[PDB]
């Protein structure tokens, strides 16, 4: 069975992708995250730090990782009617931690992306606004700066 060191290794391997994007590897990370919500705090701090630290052209893929895990966890909260935003080891708390950094992560990823990746980030902002993943007021602040 996939363990946390495997999760680390998989994320580390994104460096080796020209595009920084892999649907199958994102799916592996997301399945692991859904199976190990009991350690979401270190999963979440890692994917936040991956977005902070990855190369410029890989910023888009870092937001796809956050999108995949974030909306999988968001779906759990609605299946489970849970809003324990401050309880570690819960989907609601994981999404809350991501939301506290998401404006920083978006601003940096957009600023460091070329025009093509910027347009793909714009599409993510649409999906995050429609799905309810992050506070719309946070996404508004980003969208008004970069996409209006």
């Amino acid at each position: 069975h996939m363990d946390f060191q495997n999760f680390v290794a998989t994320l580390e391997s994104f460096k080796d992708l020209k595009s920084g994007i892999s649907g199958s590897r994102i799916k592996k990370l997301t399945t692991y995250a859904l199976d190990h919500i009991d350690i979401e705090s270190k999963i979440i701090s890692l994917i936040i730090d991956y977005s902070r630290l990855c190369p410029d052209s890989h910023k888009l893929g870092s937001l796809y990782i956050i999108d995949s895990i974030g909306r999988a966890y968001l779906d759990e909260t609605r299946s489970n009617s849970n809003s324990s935003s401050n309880k570690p080891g819960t989907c609601a708390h994981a999404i809350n931690t991501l939301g506290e950094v998401i404006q920083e992560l978006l601003s940096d990823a957009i600023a460091k992306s070329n025009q093509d990746h910027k347009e793909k980030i714009r599409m993510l902002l649409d999906i995050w606004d429609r799905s309810g993943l992050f506070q719309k007021s946070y996404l508004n602040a980003i969208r008004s700066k970069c996409f209006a």
Binding site: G23, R25, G61, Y64, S68
Partner: peptide, 6 residues
């Protein structure tokens, strides 16, 4: 091996 958010 693209990713398209759904």
């Amino acid at each position: 091996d693209d990713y398209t958010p759904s």
